[PDB]
Amino acid sequence: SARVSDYPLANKHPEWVKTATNKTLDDFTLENVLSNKVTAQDMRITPETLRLQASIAKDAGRDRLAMNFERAAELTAVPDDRILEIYNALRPYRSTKEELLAIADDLESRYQAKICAAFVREAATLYVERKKLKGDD
């Protein structure tokens, strides 16, 4: 488990930062971007990396930052347009209680985003009581 003494990863353990493809940081060159070896699809941060950073935050005594990072790790597998739909669904008066829960079930069932599902469920409940659901404005 990563500690502060492994930070910065780029300097201490760049090999820990790898793509689902074996490629390395070192591979991200003009030359391969042009020759299309490297592409957009190789350049997204991975959950594995975000959990290393979470472990480092933790070690840095920033538990809350670490929680954020764990959430982020779950959300890497969620499509951008789905990310935006879910963010918008949590904005005030956008959603029904039921819609939020469907979103939470999907996060859990299709993306194994357990923490964010729980987070969205918690929101659903409170949006009832604090009247931020669709039709409450």
């Binding site: 502060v4 930070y7 910065p8 990863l9 780029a10 300097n11 760049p14 930062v17 940081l25 991200f28 060159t29 003009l30 971007v33 042009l34 592409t39 957009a40 350049m43 997204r44 941060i45 990396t49 975000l50 290393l52 950073q53 480092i56 935050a57 840095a60 005594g61 920033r62 809350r64 930052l65 670490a66 929680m67 954020n68 990072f69 959430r71 982020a72 790790a73 779950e74 959300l75 890497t76 969620v78 951008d80 990310i83 935006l84 879910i86 963010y87 918008n88 949590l90 904005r91 005030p92 964010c116 987070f119 969205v120 918690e122 929101a123 409170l126 949006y127 604090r130 931020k132």
Partner: protein
């Protein structure tokens, strides 16, 4: 008759400022209001049941978020019972380590920590800020904008800003559809001026994340949080939607911070009769609770509100200190206009400048204030020389440096050409060589040829509608011969992949080296300890234009 003394005083610029007497019930009062809650905490079965006199039964969405995620409950009861005057002493005492205080502050309630810092004068606050700042090294952030949304000038002004020393730069739009164009200009230019400067394009929330999704920004800042629930709602968010968004940026490997600042609730009409400082403390804890690493505060855009009232500027310093004391990165405003008076604005700036903060300004205007699309900053390009001179006079590192005209001109020119290449390669509405020239030697948009903004806005929206991403800019750069820039941009992306720059106060300096509160730990312990201006940096700061060699 009229006293001629008073007729002269009546004419001073300072008398153009907006002043008001306190208005307690609408929370038009900067701090220490009689309506602010007495600190308190009640914990049962590991959860908060009472927060600052409020029973959980009455909690709003903000209370719930803070109570659940924003306070360390193991020590909450211990710190609640500590003497607030003694904690304030601890805060400025140079022999009480930051590391001894953070476990204490992070267990306070919003009201408790307000109470602690309200025992302090601005000299004690600055004495404490130099210790509580998370990154050992102070830094600076600049605004790069213009009233026409002219992308060539932005590219040019961005590289000058990077060259002068800013480690983060921010743009925004007169006309929202231009936004993709401002972002790529800022990025390209900022990269040309110094590889590693981070850029952001400040927009509506869903719009901004998309732009970061496309690779045309390397961080985001104006991720707003608010101090009362009806204001939060008109902000079009809740704590949970903002927490989710914060994690969404991280999930795309993008650094971010929330933005807040005293006065927003008043400006927006629902202060729930509390003081700005109390309300702002709730904003800081929302930020802590969401797990966001840092915050932009110190009134920021609503600076006209606390500055109108007594002790509002002291209170701005106080909200900055609470931010750092809660172990958050602080981008400490000094970015917005509040006064017609140079004396007054200097006083307001020095509060953060003298001790240093993670970002002394969260938006020094790197362009003339006429061109500043945040309605003007506390400092603009015409103050660059004044800023350097004051660093030299007080031996303070304010993050910036004196620069040579011929250096600036080349870099502005290179940036203008790099952008021209990019518009060439991406088939966007062209940038004449006349335009490049102008941008090189401009002061502001008054010196720029004007563009076809309809044409421009057409091709900028197509970026988003067609999902054209940052790699297109990279290949167009390379295609135009700027293989340099092209790679530097790849290196930001390299930084996003490793996530090291997601940590508290992270910037990227020198050779792609992250500099964060994790590897640049503030270890202030009094005189001769902590960050000290010295060596080559000092030499750099000493070398202002106009210093005659005595002999």
């Amino acid at each position: 008759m009229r006293s001629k003394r008073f007729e002269a005083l009546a004419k001073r610029p300072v008398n153009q400022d907006g002043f008001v007497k306190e208005w307690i019930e609408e929370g038009f009062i900067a701090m220490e209001s009689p309506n602010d809650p007495k600190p308190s905490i009640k914990i049962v079965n590991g959860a908060v049941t009472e927060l600052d006199g409020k029973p959980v039964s009455d909690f709003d969405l903000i209370d719930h978020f803070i109570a659940r995620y924003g306070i360390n409950l193991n020590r909450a009861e211990e710190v609640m019972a500590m003497d607030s005057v003694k904690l304030a002493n601890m805060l400025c005492d140079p022999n009480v380590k930051r590391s001894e205080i953070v476990p204490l502050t992070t267990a306070m309630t919003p009201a408790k920590i307000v109470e602690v810092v309200s025992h302090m004068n601005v000299v004690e606050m600055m004495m404490a800020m130099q210790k509580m700042r998370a990154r050992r090294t102070p830094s600076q952030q600049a605004h790069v904008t213009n009233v026409k949304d002219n992308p060539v000038q932005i590219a040019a002004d961005a590289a000058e800003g990077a060259w002068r020393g800013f480690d983060e730069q921010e743009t925004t739009v007169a006309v929202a559809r231009y936004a993709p164009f401002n972002a790529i200009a800022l990025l390209v230019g900022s990269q040309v001026g110094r590889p590693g400067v981070l850029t952001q394009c400040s927009l509506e929330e869903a719009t901004e994340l998309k732009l970061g999704m496309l690779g045309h920004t390397c961080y985001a800042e104006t991720i707003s949080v608010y101090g009362t629930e009806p204001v939060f709602t008109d902000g079009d968010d809740t704590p949970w939607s903002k927490g989710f968004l914060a994690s969404s940026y991280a999930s795309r490997g993008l650094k971010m911070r929330f933005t807040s600042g005293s006065g927003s609730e008043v400006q927006m009409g629902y202060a729930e009769g509390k003081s700005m400082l109390y309300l702002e403390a709730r904003c800081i804890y929302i930020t802590k609770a969401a797990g966001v690493q840092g915050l932009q505060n110190g009134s920021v855009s609503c600076i006209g509100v606390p500055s109108a009232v007594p002790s509002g500027i002291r209170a701005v310093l106080a909200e900055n200190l609470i931010c750092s004391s809660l172990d958050l990165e602080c981008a400490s405003s000094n970015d917005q206009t509040f006064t017609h008076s140079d004396m007054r604005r200097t006083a307001r700036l020095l509060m953060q400048f003298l001790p240093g903060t993670d970002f002394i300004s969260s938006g020094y205007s790197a362009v003339p204030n006429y061109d500043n699309m945040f309605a003007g900053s506390n400092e603009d390009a015409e103050d660059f020389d004044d800023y350097n001179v004051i660093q030299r006079d007080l031996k303070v590192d304010g993050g910036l440096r004196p620069v040579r005209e011929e250096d600036v001109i080349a870099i502005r020119n290179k940036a203008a050409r790099a952008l021209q290449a990019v518009f060439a390669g991406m088939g966007l509405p062209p940038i004449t060589d006349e335009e490049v020239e102008a941008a090189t030697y401009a002061h502001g948009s008054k010196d720029m040829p004007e563009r076809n903004i309809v044409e421009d806005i057409k091709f900028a929206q197509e970026i988003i509608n067609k999902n054209r991403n940052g790699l297109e800019v990279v290949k167009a750069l390379a295609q135009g011969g700027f293989t340099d820039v092209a790679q530097d941009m790849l290196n930001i992306q390299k930084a996003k992949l490793t996530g090291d720059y997601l940590h508290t106060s992270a910037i990227i300096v020198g050779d792609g080296q992250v500099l964060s509160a994790v590897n640049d730990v503030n270890d202030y312990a009094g005189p001769a300890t902590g960050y000290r201006l010295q060596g080559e940096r000092w030499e750099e700061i000493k070398n202002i234009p106009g210093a005659l060699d005595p002999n």
